[PDB]
Amino acid sequence: ENRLESILSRFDADWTASDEARREAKNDLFFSRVSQWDDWLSQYTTLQY
């Protein structure tokens, strides 16, 4: 199962978790941004429609 060394068990799962916290979870909260909030994103102090 999990590695004999406790800290090594973290590292082996951290490598696949890196693409989870970079790529995946970034896109994940954008789903909820379109449905629960405005479709357009990433404009800053705009007064135009």
Binding site: R23, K26, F30, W40, L41, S42, Q43, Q48
Partner: protein
């Protein structure tokens, strides 16, 4: 001499051949060198015009016979028709149909390479999708960002 005129001593006599000056005109002038310098001042500012490969030689020591226009080899075949037209009213003459036709077609071929290179659409508007057909753009909105 040569297919390329970068010397103003060869520039005057080249324009004079096209204007057919044998000094039977009302006057003889040194203007041809001064004429090209003025005609590629005008064409090189205020939104420019035709670009002929000319480089400036204004405000220099020569009388306007030693100064160097620096025109391209292919740029010769255009200019001396346009130059021979402009100095023609001074001699109480007006250019023939071949001279004005070649003058316009010549300068168009010199601008031909320029107008090709200036073609390409301006960047995307302030509102443009970031798409979901795109794979990992890692950005939302394309404003004037891309």
């Amino acid at each position: 001499t040569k297919g390329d005129l970068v010397r103003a001593a060869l520039r005057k006599l080249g324009v004079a051949s096209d204007a057919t000056l044998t000094d039977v005109e009302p006057q003889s002038m040194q203007d041809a060198v001064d004429d090209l310098e003025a005609m590629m001042a005008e064409w090189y500012q205020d939104g420019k015009g035709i670009i002929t490969g000319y480089v400036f030689s204004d405000d220099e020591n020569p009388p306007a016979e030693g100064d160097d226009h620096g025109l391209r080899s292919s740029a010769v075949s255009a200019v001396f028709h346009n130059l021979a037209c402009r100095i023609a009213p001074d001699y109480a003459l007006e250019a023939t149909a071949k001279i004005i036709a070649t003058a316009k077609y010549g300068k168009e071929l010199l601008y031909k390479q320029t107008a090709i290179s200036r073609a390409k659409r301006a960047p995307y508007p302030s509102r443009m999708p970031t798409g979901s057909g795109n794979s990992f753009p890692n950005l939302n909105e394309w404003h004037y960002f891309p």
